[PDB]
Design a protein around this nucleic acid. Structure first.
Ligand SMILES: [Mg+2]
Ligand SMILES: [Mg+2]
Ligand SMILES: [Mg+2]
Ligand SMILES: [Mg+2]
Ligand SMILES: [Mg+2]
Lengths: 197, 191, 137, 234, 171, 72
RNA sequence: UUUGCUCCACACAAUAUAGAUGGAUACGAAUAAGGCGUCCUUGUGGCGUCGCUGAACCAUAGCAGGCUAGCAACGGUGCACUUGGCGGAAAGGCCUUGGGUGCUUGCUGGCGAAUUGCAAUGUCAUUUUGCGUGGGGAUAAAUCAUUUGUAUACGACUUAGA
RNA sequence: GCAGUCAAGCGUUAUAGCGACAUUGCUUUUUGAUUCGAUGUCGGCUCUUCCUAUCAUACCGAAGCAGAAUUCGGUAA
RNA sequence: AGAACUGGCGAUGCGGGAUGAACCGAACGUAGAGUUAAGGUGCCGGAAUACACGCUCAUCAGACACCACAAAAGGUGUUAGUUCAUCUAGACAGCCGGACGGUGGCCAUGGAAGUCGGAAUCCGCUAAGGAGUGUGUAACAACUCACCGGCCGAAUGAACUA
RNA sequence: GGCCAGCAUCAGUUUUGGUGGCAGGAUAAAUCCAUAGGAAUGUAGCUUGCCUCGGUAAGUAUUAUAGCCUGUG
């Protein structure tokens, strides 16, 4: 229903989010994923770190520059999960993959855009309470990603600006609702309520 | 078995106030305030009156109800800390080399400095955790006293002080030097 | 101000007399009352005023409402109907924003094309008045 | 899984069952027929040599101990359940460690014996301290100054962990001898003692308290009445 | 499937000089009458020395629950097959019908004991008239006076792929 | 933190076919040994069933009735 | 290298291909908790209210939207200027001041529409390394060849020369 | 290995038969005394990497571990 | 390993089991429409991130052949059962108290008092208490536990099965 | 009349809805109504202990100022 769908990746499970995003891209929807460092993986941090270190074990023996390439950033971990669910060696798979962008944090112009969530991929809706889960920024920092603090500082500045914007928007919303409430007793309002609006 | 409801009770004395919101407990008493984050456990707190606070788990299993009893014990420890305090008395003994224990300030950080442990030239430094006080006992030979409202902080500081003087590569049936916790109790000794 | 404060976190309770709204099945969208608890997942419900048969149902097929009325446990259909009428459950349900939202949704679904045109005209008139009142202050 | 495992012992004495309680029940009910006066005795924290000396002194009478609930069931708990008339009052007067003295002797003789009987006893916890005790400075001896240290024996080195940990007395080991750097106050006269102080007094062997057998009341077979005696019940 | 309860009454075939043989009745839980008749012949061969070729089905009638809208506690005595022998089991099920209790029991046996319909024998399903005779804790905890319990962490199903609000689990 | 090699769980065709042959041979041998060997070949009422007394009374009454029914 | 290169307004001419056809419509955090409104002694505060999906909200009527007449109001919105402020994560966007010039379906009128023939996407949205009108702006380097040896199999590299 | 013994179990109502853990005898007997038939493939040099089933180096646990030295063991390539 | 019967395959493509001589389905003219088999329906990938009742958390779980590793072995993981017992004349934990007398039983020992050893292991009084369950002493002492009682007040323990 | 289409009325095959009349069973079982018994996860009332002005704990009390279960019709 929208030309570009922006998904706030915070609090989502990586596999289910990857599955839904891959199907959307193959169906032809343009998707931008923000805040990839706030993604979640079910299972404890040592388990997920062990899995990543097994992936790190994988490498071409006679030339390491030819082997599987291990990308440490959270956005690249999510991109690996997505590319595993797209048939990426065909032209159709490449075209589907080029309808996707993944970012750490929320850079411009997406910091002023509406961001949605995916209910079937949400941790609080999917995992049973008490089950342990891992956070992608911490996993990436443990396996060698080196921009965790910079993203945190930029995100804090973005949150300050966004809070100021929301305060102004909420004041305007209160004024609009106050103006709309005093017209609710008029004949036009009664006719609209009769028609359902 | 999935017990429908399991609950524990927490008793609050006269001078203690408890504020719990979203599993952030603040306990205020005559000796000061303590704060605990319990957001890793799914429990529900309810206030019955100013003296009784219930903590409950709904539709929970064995691990969940074990966590419930643990939560009750932790809040009881916080209450005891703000009303009586905790006091750990340690003793340090030696065979030949007198152990020298001092309180030093390293950029205003309150370290405990241990010298001449078994004749070592190394200076052992144990930081003093915030909220605990270190006093050298009067008319008791070679006794240290750690006091505070947090039993966790006091006991961990005592354990760090005890572990900083591990005897290495010597028969410990023979080499008896060290710093040992000799007593645990409360700061208040009115009765 | 030397008294403890603990957040209540008030849940709706599965209990006898709790009014539920059936969200799927033959009786979808109808009100019923919980008469007896079978286990953690199933209850016995009875909906005599709205025409819901007395039946055992899973708690995942209903949504609990904030409404509750006094009812004996295991009360038969006649007793449930009498207590429901005495407590006036239907009026208190219809006075809530939840039921008003359901009614508005049904009305909007029932609107015709001519009525949608009339809605647009009335919305433009109300918009003119609201914007004028908003600019003056 | 994850349950506590019971410790296993290999000893000779096995637990008593309901048959022992039934035997005690029948013995009490038969002594109720056999004897004239049934006296209820409070004998809490009694030592076995003292109790056996009492039994030896009361040759010809029957002293029966046991669980107080068993004794009250033998006597009859309520008015419709009493074994004899006006025995429920005697049964409900039983409290604590209760013994039953069935006898045919005189009321005056029983009162005189239980007024004039007394023995030296350990100072029990939650009681009154009979003396002020102070362990002297230097080498700690077995009596702790209650006798001259020239005649006394030094305390064994094996008790130093108990004194330091359980008794919380600051002690050191010097050449195999227990030593305290300062004199130590154990108890003050006319003060309530706790478990730790009572244990210290018992360890040093000081026994200045008095044991007296309390008597609550008695029942007569022919009169079918209960009279409060109130002996050593201050 | 969803079980029904039948009565199956059968007998040996009448013969000369042995007329009017005895009639034997069983209460059978089964999804349909074909399964009910098969189970009847199985149990009749296991108990008596009566074969399907030697006998006939006199009657089969569905038995309905007497009060299907009344909550009841059921004690279910069952017997299952093992290589060492046949072992008893007693379960307690709270439900509004005998067929509902039997279906719950079959599902529980398949979940826990890894058991099947052909191996599970229903020996007795008996309603507990008085609550004092209930002796399973998972059933007794629901017999408390004024029973109230909440449902924390409600998970709402979404009809759309994307949601424009962060969800809440309040109830 | 040196992770070791994980055992593969990909199915080998030769291993699976060999396991099939091994299992068939095992079944034949077990059947043969069960036929050849020599070895000599009611739990009652569960204690938790509430109407134990009723079941026992019914079975006793049926036994006593059948005692005289088959005799005369 | 027959006036080359490059931005601003004005007419023509073509142009919009992983798939426009009303609008991607901006708090953060928690979920065994929150959002909003309000009051006070401003807090882990009291009270009220909301959820149970965006099935929303905003826009949306006029020859693909024409030509005119009025009533009410001083609002809404488009375009070109202009005042000031903020934004560097990839800012390239966000907010705002004042005047001008259009439209306004908030309300009531008067004309026009046809024949695309009973449907045929029935063509409607930004950017234009192409032309002709015109006002201002600026007049380079690299390679070969020669040369050095901090370099070198050859290329390459590193120096120097109006 | 062979031949037994015991019995926690399994089996049974015929006190048959299987049987874990233990255990005995032979090989092997008392004063630390005093090379025997590989019937067909093997070693080097240079140089790389892997495994851990660790010899050394690191950190630990136990031991009549006083000290010194050593033995057994844990994590560890 | 040897006999007897019957299938499959070679001469045979097609659907499924990721892949394939003997596995599941089904045998073949060229096409259209419909329905299915076996196998499946998160994404690759056509098809329910269906419904329902339970179980499981694995410092490389499992999604498998049902053979082996496998001793139906080990585990203070978790769930459901079976059989025994104890229990308001008071269940299990916990604290306190009692835990005696002949007697320091006999022999042996430099010493040996229940506790280095060898043989007796009895009697009394008991509510109960071993000629002693362990720590300990050079021997004693002291503590313990076997057993009993007081306080507490409602279910508990053991062994098996899955 | 060659090429490509749209609609209507039909035929053959098929897929997906709405709705009507019947018939069986314990001539469904239930709900509901009446009647006779009964009990607790004991409703009203009564008594007592002592509590915030009557809200509780324990005895009684089988429909009363709530109800439920079973049999029969
Ligand atoms: Mg017009
Ligand atoms: Mg190793
Ligand atoms: Mg698909
Ligand atoms: Mg192997
Ligand atoms: Mg047709």
């Amino acid at each position: 229903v929208e030309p570009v769908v922006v998904i706030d990746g915070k609090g989502h499970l990586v596999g289910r989010l990857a599955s839904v995003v891959a199907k959307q891209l193959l169906n032809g929807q343009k998707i931008v994923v923000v805040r990839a460092e706030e993604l979640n993986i079910s299972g404890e941090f040592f388990r997920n770190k062990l899995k990543y270190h097994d992936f790190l074990r994988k490498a071409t023996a006679f030339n390491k520059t030819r082997g599987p390439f291990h990308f440490r950033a959270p956005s690249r971990i999510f991109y690996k999960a997505l590319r595993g669910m797209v048939s990426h060696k065909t032209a159709r798979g490449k075209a589907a993959l080029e309808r996707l962008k993944v970012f750490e944090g929320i850079p411009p112009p997406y910091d002023k855009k509406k961001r949605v969530v995916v209910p079937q991929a949400l941790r609080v809706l999917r995992l049973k309470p008490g089950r342990k889960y891992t956070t992608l920024g911490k996993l990436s920092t443990s396996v060698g990603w080196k921009y965790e603090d910079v993203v945190a500082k930029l995100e804090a500045k973005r949150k300050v600006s966004s809070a100021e914007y929301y305060a102004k928007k909420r004041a305007f919303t209160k004024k609009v609702a106050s103006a709309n409430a005093t017209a609710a007793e008029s004949d036009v309002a009664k006719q609209l309520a009769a028609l359902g609006y | 078995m999935k017990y429908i409801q399991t609950e524990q009770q927490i008793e609050v004395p006269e001078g203690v106030t408890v504020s719990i919101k979203s599993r952030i407990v603040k306990v205020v008493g005559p000796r000061g305030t303590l704060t605990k984050n319990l957001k890793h456990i799914d429990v529900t707190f309810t206030k019955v009156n100013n003296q009784l606070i219930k903590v409950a788990v709904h539709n929970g299993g064995r691990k969940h109800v074990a966590a419930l009893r643990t939560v009750k014990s932790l809040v009881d420890n916080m209450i005891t800390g703000v009303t009586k305090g905790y006091k750990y008395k340690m003793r340090y003994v030696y065979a030949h080399f007198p152990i020298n224990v001092n309180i030093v300030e390293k950029d205003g950080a309150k370290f405990i400095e241990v010298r001449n442990f078994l004749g070592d030239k190394k200076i052992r430094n144990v930081p003093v955790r915030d909220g605990v006080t270190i006093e050298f006992s009067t008319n008791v030979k070679d006794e240290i006293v750690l006091s505070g409202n947090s039993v966790e902080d006091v006991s961990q500081n005592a354990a760090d002080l005890q572990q900083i003087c591990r005897v290495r590569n010597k028969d410990i049936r023979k080499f008896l030097d060290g710093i040992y916790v000799s007593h645990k109790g409360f700061i208040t000794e009115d009765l | 101000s030397t008294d403890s404060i603990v957040k209540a976190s008030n849940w709706r309770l599965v209990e006898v007399g709790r009014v539920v709204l059936i969200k799927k099945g033959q009786s979808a969208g109808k009100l019923a009352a919980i008469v007896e608890i079978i286990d953690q997942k199933k209850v016995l419900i009875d909906g005599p005023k709205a025409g819901v048969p007395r039946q055992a149902i899973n708690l995942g097929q209903v949504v609990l409402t904030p409404l509750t009325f006094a009812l004996p446990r295991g009360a038969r259909t006649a007793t449930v109907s009498k207590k429901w009428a005495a407590a006036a459950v239907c009026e208190k349900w219809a006075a809530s924003s939840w039921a008003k939202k359901i009614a508005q949704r049904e009305r909007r679904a029932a609107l015709t094309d001519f009525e949608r045109f009339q809605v647009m005209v009335l919305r433009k008139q109300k918009r003119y008045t609201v914007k004028k009142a908003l600019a003056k202050a | 899984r994850s349950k506590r495992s019971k410790l296993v012992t290999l000893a000779q004495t096995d637990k008593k069952g309901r048959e022992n309680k039934e035997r005690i029940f029948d013995e009490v009910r038969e002594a109720l027929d056999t004897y004239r006066y049934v006296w209820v005795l409070h004998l809490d924290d009694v030592r076995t040599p003292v109790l056996q000396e009492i039994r030896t002194s009361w040759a010809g009478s029957k002293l029966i101990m046991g669980k107080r609930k068993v004794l009250q069931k033998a006597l009859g708990e309520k008015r419709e359940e009493e074994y004899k008339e006006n025995l429920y009052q005697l049964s409900k007067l039983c409290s604590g460690v209760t013994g039953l003295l069935f006898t045919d002797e005189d009321v005056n003789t029983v009162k005189e014996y239980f007024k004039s009987y007394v023995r030296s006893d350990y100072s029990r916890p939650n009681t009154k301290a009979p003396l002020t005790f102070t362990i002297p400075e230097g080498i700690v001896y077995s009596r702790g100054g209650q006798i001259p240290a020239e005649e006394d024996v030094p305390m064994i080195h094996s008790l130093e962990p108990t004194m330091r940990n359980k008794f919380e007395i600051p002690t050191k080991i010097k050449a195999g001898k227990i030593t305290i750097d300062s004199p130590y106050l154990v108890c003050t006269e006319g003060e309530k003692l706790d478990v730790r102080q009572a244990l210290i007094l018992k360890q040093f062997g000081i026994a200045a308290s008095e044991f007296k057998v309390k008597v609550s009341a008695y029942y007569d077979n022919d009169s079918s009445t209960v009279e409060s005696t109130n002996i050593n019940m201050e | 499937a969803h079980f029904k309860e039948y009565q199956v009454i059968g007998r040996r075939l009448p013969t000369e000089s042995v007329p009017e043989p005895k009639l034997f009745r069983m209460r059978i839980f089964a999804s349909n009458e074909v399964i009910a008749k098969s189970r009847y012949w199985y149990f009749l061969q296991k108990l008596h020395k009566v074969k399907k070729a030697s006998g006939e089905i006199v009657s089969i009638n569905q038995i309905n629950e007497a009060h299907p809208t009344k909550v009841k506690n059921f004690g279910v005595w069952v017997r299952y097959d093992s290589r060492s022998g046949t072992h008893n089991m007693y379960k307690e099920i709270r439900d509004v019908s005998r067929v509902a209790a039997v279906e719950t029991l079959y599902q529980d046996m398949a979940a826990r004991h890894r058991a099947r319909f052909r191996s599970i024998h229903i020996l007795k399903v008996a309603e507990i008239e008085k609550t004092a005779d209930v002796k399973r804790q998972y059933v007794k905890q629901f017999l408390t006076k004024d029973l109230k319990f909440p449902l924390p962490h409600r998970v709402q199903k979404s009809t759309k792929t994307f949601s424009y609000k962060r969800p809440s689990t309040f109830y | 933190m040196r992770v070791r090699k994980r055992q593969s769980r990909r199915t080998s065709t030769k291993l699976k076919e060999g396991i099939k042959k091994k299992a068939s041979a095992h079944r034949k041998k077990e059947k043969k040994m069960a036929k050849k060997d020599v070895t000599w070949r009611d739990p009652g009422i569960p204690s938790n069933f509430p109407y134990k007394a009723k079941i026992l009374e019914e079975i006793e009454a049926k036994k006593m009735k059948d005692l005289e029914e088959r005799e005369l």
